[PDB]
């Protein structure tokens, strides 16, 4: 085998999730400009 | 009694209006308008009241209130 190369050895055969930042304040717009439920509180209002 | 409006109320506030990113000091700058206008209308709101000779404001003075400050308000009344 390639033991007995003594001049130009073969070399050749051997070696949680986040979301990004932005998203969640848009799905947020989303929701609330879909219903028309008050946002303030109602006893700390009055 | 002004800090009961906070944090997320006008966080929800914004994102009805369609914000996306808000400043620390929105807030309390939000605050100071939002005292303004109270104070504008329900001073007018108050005056009617005087002139009624009555001690409660019913759900009229604050629509008509609103009404002589160019707010006008449907459904709480004719």
New interface residues.
């Given amino acids: 085998a390639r033991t007995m190369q003594t001049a130009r050895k073969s070399t050749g055969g051997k070696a949680p999730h986040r979301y990004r930042p ?1 998203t969640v ?2 799905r ?2 989303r ?3 879909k219903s028309t439920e008050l ?3 109602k006893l ?2 009055q | ?1 002004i800090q ?2 906070t944090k997320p ?1 006008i966080r ?2 914004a ?2 209006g ?4 808000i400043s620390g000091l929105i807030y309390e700058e939000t605050r100071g308008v939002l005292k303004v206008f109270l104070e504008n209308v329900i001073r007018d709101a108050v005056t009617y009241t005087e002139h009624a000779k009555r001690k409660t404001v019913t759900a009229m003075d604050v629509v008509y209130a609103l009404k002589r400050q160019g707010r006008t308000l449907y459904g709480f009344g004719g």
């Avoid at chain 2, 369609?18 to 990113?21: A, E, N, S």
Wanted: charge should be positive; proline fraction near 4%; glycine fraction near 12%.
């Fill in positions: 932005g304040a848009l947020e717009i929701r609330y400009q946002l303030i509180r700390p209002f | 009694n009961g409006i109320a929800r506030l994102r009805r369609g914000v996306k990113r």
